[PDB]
């Protein structure tokens, strides 16, 4: 006879919306039935009532710690349909900010994970780095979280004048900030007690279940869309892909921790190779014209009017 | 053209550190074990000396 | 090996000076690690609202 407990919704590990109905025979989980939809909003129904430009912010708020990668997936879909090309500088900016976004997301995931197991301090240390990067978000887009910066055709605005230096200055010390978290976590035997051989997933079942990302690379399969289907400027930059072998919580932790380093490498490369030119596609039938044209030129004013109406 | 755009320096930035930097520190484990044995031995020496003298004080009392 | 350790004086972070520097180097797990605090005269200065490049920018 199974004993049924409602894990979540009001539970810090549950993240507030995970009603996880478990059935226990003593200590051991026999069946698990996650219930979702406490955060079903009808994003997909609402997008059909929105222009593409208007529908872009729906994606910021899907994975609300990886905003710019969401904007990037939607932008790539719409540009592929539109048969247009993002300028080089725009591609490089989208790569830099995709990796700043990856760093932010991994800080949130790793530190929230360690807080769930009980390690409360990396939460705060990594949250200061999160603050530093959200300064860069706010400087390029005007919002800390929901930037709406990456748009079909490129990015909404060019970088402010003093941003590359500040990113580089932060990059000179992020390495140490990582080493300190690793000092607390990588070799701690309690951490390895909580993570080694927990949640083991085989390669074949990983493929069968539809898992991707670290959840798949932890099981030994070297698959990475950035290397396999080179999108944006992921072919102009040099980085490695970490692959686990045991497919347990510890391998995935190691993978994430090394993806931190690879992201730092990519950010530095884009800081060194940022080219000049436009940031959005230069056809005013897709992206709006600069305001100095919109206020002097008839064609530009018409295109601006139509694009925003 | 491109005037006033944020651009990297002509020579580029100095390379940042990104590989793992967790240098090993500490004496060898056997040195720590030897220190522990020394401290424990000296402590036992003093403790047993004190116990014996306390016994002689008990004799006097 | 590129990406290896760089010394703490090439990192834009406050750190320590004087006798306290020597104390820090003696007592640090890894002496080349920065403290995380950005250098006030260097970091995010001039402020974004007072960049001189704003008055020269032209659409690319």
């Amino acid at each position: 006879r199974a004993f049924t407990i409602n894990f979540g919704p009001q539970h810090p590990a549950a993240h507030g919306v995970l009603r996880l109905i478990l059935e226990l025979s003593g200590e051991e989980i026999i069946r698990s039935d996650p219930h979702v939809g406490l955060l079903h909003r009808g994003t997909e129904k609402l997008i059909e009532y929105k222009t593409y430009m208007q529908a872009l912010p729906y994606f910021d708020r899907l994975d609300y710690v990886s905003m710019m990668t969401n904007e990037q997936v939607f932008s790539l879909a719409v540009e592929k349909l539109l048969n247009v090309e993002v300028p080089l500088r725009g591609k490089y900016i989208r790569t830099m900010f995709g990796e700043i976004t990856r760093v932010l997301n991994h800080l949130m995931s790793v530190c929230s994970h360690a807080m769930d197991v009980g390690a409360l301090t990396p939460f705060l240390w990594g949250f200061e780095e999160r603050e530093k990067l959200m300064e860069f978000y706010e400087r390029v887009s005007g919002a800390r979280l929901h930037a709406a910066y990456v748009r079909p055709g490129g990015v909404s605005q060019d970088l402010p004048a003093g941003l590359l230096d500040d990113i580089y200055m932060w990059a000179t010390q992020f390495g140490d900030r990582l080493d300190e978290i690793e000092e607390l976590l990588t070799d701690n035997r309690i951490w390895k007690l909580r993570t080694v051989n927990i949640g083991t997933v085989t390669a074949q079942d990983a493929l069968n279940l539809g898992l991707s990302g670290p959840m798949l690379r932890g099981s030994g399969i070297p698959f990475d869309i950035r290397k396999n289907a080179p999108y944006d400027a992921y072919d102009k930059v040099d980085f490695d892909v970490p692959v686990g072998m045991n497919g347990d919580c510890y391998d995935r932790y190691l993978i994430r921790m090394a993806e931190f380093r690879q992201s730092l490498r990519i950010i530095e490369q884009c800081c060194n190779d940022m080219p000049a030119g436009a940031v959005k596609v230069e056809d005013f039938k897709i992206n709006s014209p600069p305001r100095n044209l919109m206020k002097e030129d008839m064609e530009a004013l018409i295109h601006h009017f139509l694009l925003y109406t | 053209p491109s005037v006033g755009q944020d651009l990297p320096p002509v020579g580029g930035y100095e390379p940042v550190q990104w590989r793992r930097n967790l240098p090993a520190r500490g004496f060898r484990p056997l040195v720590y074990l030897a220190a522990l044995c020394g401290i424990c031995g000296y402590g036992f020496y003093r403790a047993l000396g004190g116990i014996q003298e306390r016994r002689e004080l008990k004799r006097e009392k | 090996l590129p990406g290896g350790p760089v010394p703490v004086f090439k990192k834009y972070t406050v750190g320590s000076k004087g006798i306290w520097e020597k104390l820090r180097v003696l007592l640090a797990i890894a002496p080349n690690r920065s403290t995380g605090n950005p250098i006030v005269p260097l970091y995010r200065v001039p402020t974004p609202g007072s960049r001189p490049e704003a008055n020269v920018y032209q659409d690319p």
Binding site: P87, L88, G162, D165, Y168, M169, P275, A276, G277, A278 | P1, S2, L7, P8, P9, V10, G11, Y13 | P7, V8, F9, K10, K11, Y12, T13, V14, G15, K17, E21, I39, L42, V45, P60
Partner: peptide, 24 residues
Amino acid sequence: PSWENIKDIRLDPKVHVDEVYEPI
């Protein structure tokens, strides 16, 4: 050899292009 004399990046010579060429 210390942070008080770390070189000011903000005054380094930046790269400058005159015309950007992006083929159609």
